[PDB]
Amino acid sequence: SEQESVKEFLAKAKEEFLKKWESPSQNTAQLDHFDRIKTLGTGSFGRVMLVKHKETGNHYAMKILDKQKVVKLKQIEHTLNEKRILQAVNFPFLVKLEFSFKDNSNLYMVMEYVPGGEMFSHLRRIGRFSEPHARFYAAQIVLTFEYLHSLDLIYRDLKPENLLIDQQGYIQVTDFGFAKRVKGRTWTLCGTPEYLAPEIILSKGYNKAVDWWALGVLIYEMAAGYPPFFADQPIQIYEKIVSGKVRFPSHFSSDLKDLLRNLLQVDLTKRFGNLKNGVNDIKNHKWFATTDWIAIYQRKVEAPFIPKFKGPGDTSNFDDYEEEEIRVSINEKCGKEFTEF
Amino acid sequence: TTYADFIASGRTGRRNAI
Lengths: 341, 18
Ligand SMILES: O=S(=O)(c1cccc2cnccc12)N1CCCN(Cc2ccccc2B(O)O)CC1
Ligand SMILES: [Cl-]
Fold this sequence. Notes:
heterodimer; A: alpha+beta; Transferase(Phosphotransferase), domain 1; Phosphorylase Kinase, domain 1; 2 domains; 5-stranded antiparallel β-sheet; two-stranded antiparallel ribbon; 9 strands; B: mainly alpha; binds the ligand O=S(=O)(c1cccc2cnccc12)N1CCCN(Cc2ccccc2B(O)O)CC1; binds chloride ion; transferase
């Protein structure tokens, strides 16, 4: 019986998660253990660099967060949360945290390097994915949300920008600052405009169903090449989202449109993933009839697309940035705020 | 086309969280 096997698997996974949540790892490397290779990304309070571990030669992505900037932009809780989640979860489609540490100036999260880069750039380059291609990625997100929701985590950050494609063509989910434990409801206005469920926009108390809405947005964008609700300004996007109207490209299959009508459902009593049968309403939908869910989880399905890779440290799938210093102050900054990191 | 309208929206690059 697969159902009993899934229940046992998820109960074991929850025990392991809670153990690691209660006793997080800390201070498992230091900066001079690494050589910097290239800046892979920049943000308002941090950067991501390709680094090489001097002792082993292994490549990693090092997320470097400026503590003072985190404090300025009110991201203390999100940043502490991301690291605590990353060191506690364990699932094939979630990025792996290898080391973490801090110094006078910065917080550091060292993760396995995924040279294939973001789904976003591959999607924009190719234009759109065929439905079998979109379905392959969609299935991995379904299973990832089944795992996260079983831990009572709402993800709240789904978009192609936050999905990496690894060397076997499978997805790695990257970001967890917004992942909150919610057994009941929560209220924060957060996410990315195109991916916000209507109940978030309408300032309602909301739950894990917002992730299944976001899955609908992701599937639509992957298959069409553009998201279902867009406009010049976020407020105009929000008006479209809450309207309950959506149009589909003529090349969308009937099965795809039916799935999307049930995921992009403004009424929570009708949205797939939020009904009595839960995720099984999605897994058993006709669009997924050819999906071997166990084989996806085991990464035994041949990926439809493998990114170009010329070595463990190739950076060709990432943008080019001006290389700036990593300055570490002589004075400790914000020590109390980040004591638990 | 709808694609053209998407390009006209200007939100074709990486999107920030609110
Ligand atoms: O740079 S990433 O693609 C990335 C993230 C995690 C593991 C990675 C392993 N190999 C390669 C790249 C990796 N990336 C994916 C999401 C986009 N952000 C934006 C960003 C940029 C700067 C500072 C913070 C953030 B943030 O997210 O909160 C950076 C992380
Ligand atoms: Cl961009």
